[PDB]
Amino acid sequence: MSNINLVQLVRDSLFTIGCPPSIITDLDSHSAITISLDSMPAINIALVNEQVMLWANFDAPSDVKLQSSAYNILNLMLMNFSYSINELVELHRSDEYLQLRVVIKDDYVHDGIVFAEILHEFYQRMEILNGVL
């Protein structure tokens, strides 16, 4: 009914990573949470169908850029992600963005220390994608 517990989870996770809660923002008690990052798209976190979803919107690359970076991107996408409901991080393409998305299993969203590791790994996947875009 509210994002209050998700906000607290993210906050708790950031104490463990070593970042301040000043980078965490939201619109209201029902919106997605945003973690602003330097030189990278923000990490968005929200409850979608009672499941925690993390996503990042990268500016969509041209077809030719995707071609020169395809091997690197494919290898990234084939990497298992243990906390995901399907064991993977997903890539969704729209006209404007190439979006990295993952839906986390309920087993891992009730412990800020574990969620810190999830955020850290998602950030690492984002770093790899950012480096080849």
Q: Does 32 engage in binding with Cl ion (CB under 5 A)?
A: no
Order the strands of the 90-93 sheet from edge to edge: 24-26, 33-37, 40-48, 51-59, 97-104, 90-93
Look up tokens 């950030």; give the residue: 123
**What tokens were used for 127?**
């770093």
In the complex, what is the shortest distance from the CB of residue 75 to a copy of itself, in angstroms, rounded to a whole number?
8
- Residue among 21, 31, 36, 92 that touches a copy of itself (CB under 8 A): 92
The answer to whether 78 contacts a copy of itself (rule: CB under 8 A) is yes
Q: Give 102's contacts (C-beta < 8 A, 6+ positions apart).
A: 53, 54, 55, 81, 83, 84, 88, 89, 90, 122
The pair of structure tokens assigned to 50 is 């009672």
Q: Amino acid identity of 115?
A: F
Choose among Cl ion, a copy of itself, none what residue 117 binds, the Cβ cut-off being 5 to 8 Å by kind: none
Q: Which does 109 bind (CB under 5 to 8 A by kind): a copy of itself, Cl ion, none?
A: Cl ion
Closest Cα partner for 6 from 43, 39, 45, 64?
45
Binding-site member from 33, 100, 109, 129 for Cl ion (CB under 5 A): 109
From the list Cl ion, a copy of itself, none, pick the one residue 123 interacts with, judged by a Cβ distance below 5 to 8 Å according to partner type. Answer: Cl ion
**Interface residue with a copy of itself, options 19, 37, 47, 66 (CB under 8 A):** 66
Residues near a copy of itself (CB under 8 A) are 66-67, 70-71, 73-75, 77-78, 80, 86-88, 90-93, 103
